[PDB]
Design a protein around this ligand. Sequence first.
Ligand SMILES: [Ca+2]
Ligand SMILES: [Ca+2]
Length: 320
Amino acid sequence: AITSNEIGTHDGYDYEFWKDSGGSGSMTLNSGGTFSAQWSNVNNILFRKGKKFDETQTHQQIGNMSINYGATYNPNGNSYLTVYGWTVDPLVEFYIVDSWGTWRPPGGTPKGTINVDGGTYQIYETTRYNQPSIKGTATFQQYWSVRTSKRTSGTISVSEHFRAWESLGMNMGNMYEVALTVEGYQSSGSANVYSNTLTIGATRVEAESMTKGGPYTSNITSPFNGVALYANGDNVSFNHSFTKANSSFSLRGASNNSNMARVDLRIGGQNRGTFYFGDQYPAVYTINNINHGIGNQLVELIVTADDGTWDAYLDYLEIR
Ligand SMILES: [Ca+2]
Ligand SMILES: [Ca+2]
């Protein structure tokens, strides 16, 4: 295990153990973006796995960034579970915080909010005066998106936070780092980051992000994150701008049991086909060659053949 400061690359990912004086820590690196960590009686500690960059590109130039993660997170004291990193020129230290210990960061008055990844994050900006940094002691801005309640797994749409910050005038520099991170302050604890995939660079719409309609539509977590349509008239819908007139649609779903489940597709109020799922194991059903014509159009997925013998579970819809 790593028990003192160290920077390196492990299985494709840039890792770092960093602490100041006082107490101890231990970090074990596992496959891909994963790692586990332990600390006690620290002042400041950071464990992370992500990507470090060469400081010549903006986040736009590098491309879309998304982290998909899960962690077991048991801090004892002040701690964060967060995406963390830096820009340079200008020097900015930044956090997208999904969970924490005893204290929810960072103090001060929010500049804004963003609703993303199924949660709500309040946005903050502070100046740090004469503080340690990747470039030595310096004065720099610190930007934060902090979830309004705790979560320890899911998807963090890093680029979307970056754009929200910029839209509020929180200017960003060239990237130095983006990493899923475990931080402790004046604390002890442990964490097991069992899943951490950083993805850099067809539209997929998650069922659980669409508008719900009908009497019973509800979110589900098994056999995937998505929604259940239980009765006639249960639906989910969203608006989409079609740029061509002809598309393929792929729905990933399942029945709740071994009876076949069916979900009708409509575009601008008109019936365009049905998706079939023959049992409880997730699968993708694809409707090809749908002529619908151009512009903003309401996409709906709705149950119309329910008879009290099955429900339809929907994970996501892909449009090509
Ligand atoms: Ca039903
Ligand atoms: Ca889903």
